Design a protein around this nucleic acid. Sequence first.
DNA 1: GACCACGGCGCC
DNA 2: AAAGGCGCCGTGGTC
Length: 539
Amino acid sequence: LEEAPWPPPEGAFVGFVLSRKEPMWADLLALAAARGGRVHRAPEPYKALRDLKEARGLLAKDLSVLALREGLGLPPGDDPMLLAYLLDPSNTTPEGVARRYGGEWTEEAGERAALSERLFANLWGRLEGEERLLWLYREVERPLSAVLAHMEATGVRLDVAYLRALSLEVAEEIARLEAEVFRLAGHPFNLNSRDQLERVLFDELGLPAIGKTEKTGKRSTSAAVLEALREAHPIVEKILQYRELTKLKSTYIDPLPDLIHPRTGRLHTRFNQTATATGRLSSSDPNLQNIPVRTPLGQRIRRAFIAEEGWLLVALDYSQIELRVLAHLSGDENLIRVFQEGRDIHTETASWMFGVPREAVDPLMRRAAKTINFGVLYGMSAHRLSQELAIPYEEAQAFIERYFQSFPKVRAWIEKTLEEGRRRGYVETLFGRRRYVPDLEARVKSVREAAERMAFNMPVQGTAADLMKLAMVKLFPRLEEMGARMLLQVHDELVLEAPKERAEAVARLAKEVMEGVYPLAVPLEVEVGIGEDWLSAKE
DNA sequence: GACCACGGCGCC
DNA sequence: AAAGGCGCCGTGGTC
Ligand SMILES: Nc1ncnc2c1ncn2[C@H]1C[C@H](O)[C@@H](COP(=O)(O)OP(=O)(O)OP(=O)(O)O)O1
Ligand SMILES: [Mg+2]
Ligand SMILES: [Mg+2]
């Protein structure tokens, strides 16, 4: 491959080396580009960044985020990772993709640029005549990479001093709990070691082991086990409380304040575009899609995510999105009329679980009801239904005679979905995103049945993901116009930041864009709230 | 220091 | 522990 002096012509493919994976923290070690049988290697990569008009190549978005960090608008364009991921969503890393589609992912920018060029050639050919995947690439994934780059580079503000104070308070409560556990154990041990805990609970104390761990067959110490032991010894309660606190402390309270960026004063996640089997995004480095919210301490942590001075957070959450998608994908009339009319199913379940009027339902009672209706839907055991409801098997089985009894075409839809996955080797979303599920004709029931659950979940979860992504693509230019920002995506929700004076307008526009993204046989409802913090913006 | 598997658990 | 999708923790082990 011919070496030519740096600058490349327009439309060249880029290769780059980062000192580390996170583009907001990374030093740009090298930059190169490829076109027309020439490779161009940058003498000094930061300065060489100014010459490009767009990031075109493997991991295009990551380079674009680093460009934005440096005050440059270098939007991501074609990325062979996105083409390969649409073909087969197990194409998630560039190591894998290079080997599969015609090269080797090295640690050299020039080779990486050449690799991008020839991988795009090959992958663009594989998507010839794959009209619906091409639509997803042009209308969702490629434009979405730009949106996510802005989200990544913008970050979210975090109340740091508040989290530091919270840390010292939770440290004292943890100390209280561990001292009481050690007394009840009759000795101190490492309470964070589940192996040590196993021996204390089941050998030294006499408590009955319920279940076993999956890979190594040890006696389980999980919450589900411990809940069934909640009055068989006073120690179990303390352990459950200790687990809650140390999880939140070790994962959220302590690490997040140390991740504030020195230039932005904000906390920056990565939104991974080729990481799931269904077409959802993921978030990492720090994961901001699992910030807690259920428990009171969880809520305290969520209040730490705050609007910039003079701005408000706007949180928009789709209501019962997968259930509405199912009504559409299947065509079940009784499910369609429930949404056409305007009933609630999470609240319907909660008021019958807890045995209270509907007016007496609240947020945390609906939390319980989400394990039940989703859980039950995607192939839950009658037996486990009994456990989390905490009732007999006779009442848990008859619920899956009622949750299903009314809806003939859901069953027919699952079965149709499974038979097509067996035939074609893949299942698909409403827009034709594929997941290959090979184990549907496996000869071992438990493997076959796990594969089935995965297979009929994907059109549902994947369609909801497609809708949210499309909604993000259309919403983004409208917010830039209003001087507003998109901060986070959490599967079925978005969090925006709007100047105080334009917040209510932003809220109304965003809602309307999300409700009418792609009309279905049933309406999409979005709940919206505005606030100084992430918690209060939903309440 | 790094990587990994595992159990465990946060969110959707 | 009991018939969906993730990423990150501490442990325990390894190199
Ligand atoms: N426990 C779960 N198991 C499987 N899927 C889940 C679970 N919790 C949530 N999801 C999926 C299904 C939801 O439609 C989707 C979005 O989550 P979420 O907002 O919490 O519930 P929801 O959209 O159905 O109700 P709502 O928004 O009205 O409170 O993610
Ligand atoms: Mg939600
Ligand atoms: Mg695991």
